[model samples]
Target: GAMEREDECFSCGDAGQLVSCKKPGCPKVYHADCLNLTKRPAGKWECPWHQCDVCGKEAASFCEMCPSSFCKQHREGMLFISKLDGRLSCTEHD
Candidate 1:
């Protein structure tokens, strides 16, 4: 049963999360906590396409509001809605 599984650590050839490479044309993949990365000299990674959804500029961060996307300077006011929730719920409270 286990042999039917189709996954493994990309670099170590073991089993773990397959962390993708951030390089432009590189095909390298590995676990996030690999030994080579645990060393003091491991470099950083930058996502190539997490830009602002509207302005086409780089994003400092993303807004948390549902059905919206933007950085700090162009985001809607934070509003948490709770429909008759003493706590919170999926559908309307009964």
Candidate 2:
């Protein structure tokens, strides 16, 4: 199930039209303006907390089975690929 959204923006604490992290259990939310985003995103989006901790880039995938994020380069050695749907799961979950 999707997580509940926060009542206030993570950066400015304002309550209007906030966007939330797309991760299933993460509750972070922010206003597009507060995050300096100029337009709404069209696809799956994760918050800064899910940015690759090692390289500071937006993650290629956030592990469905654990709290790890990785870019395609960093994910080479750290992620496990699911056989059926090819989802990325972190090594911690394997």
Candidate 3:
């Protein structure tokens, strides 16, 4: 006999498809297809946090490496490169 098992959403515990953060050592998860983050800005992606990366103040930018947010003072430049596929590879340039 096959037993039915209870499943839980690993990221938000909302019971849906699991979304895993791509950053290493980052445990934050979300619903699959729920978070709409993009490597490059398409004029639609919104950040998901409210804290600054340097001062712990209100955030205005989202770090690509992890969930750390950034305030106006901490918001840095986003670096990108043009790939051979003609797609832009955007990342937090340090």
Give the whole-model CA lDDT for all candidates, comma-separated.
Answer: 0.40, 0.70, 0.46
What TM-score number comes out for model 2?
0.49
List, residue by residue over 1-94, the lDDT tens digit for candidate 2. 1658777765565688888787797776777876667867777876765777469787777665444578878878787887767876666753
**Over the stretch 1-94, how does candidate 3's per-residue lDDT look in tens digits?**
0132225433244666644444343345555444444344343322344456468687765544444566776665542333544432235433
Lowest summed lDDT window (length 10), candidate 1 = 85-94
- Clashes in predicted model 3: 0
Superior candidate under TM-score, 1 versus 3? 3
lDDT by residue for model 1 (1-94), tens: 1123235543356777655545454343446575344543345553222345557566544322221234455433422234454322212222
- By TM-score, the best candidate is 2
Best-to-worst ranking by TM-score = 2, 3, 1
lDDT of 1 at 46: 30
State in Å the error of residue 2, model 1.
31
For lDDT, the strongest prediction is 2
Candidate 1 residue 65 Cα shift, in angstroms, is 45
Clashes of each: 0, 0, 0
List where candidate 1 sits over 4 angstroms from the true fold. 1-10, 35-94
Clashing pairs in 1: none
Clashing pairs in 3: none
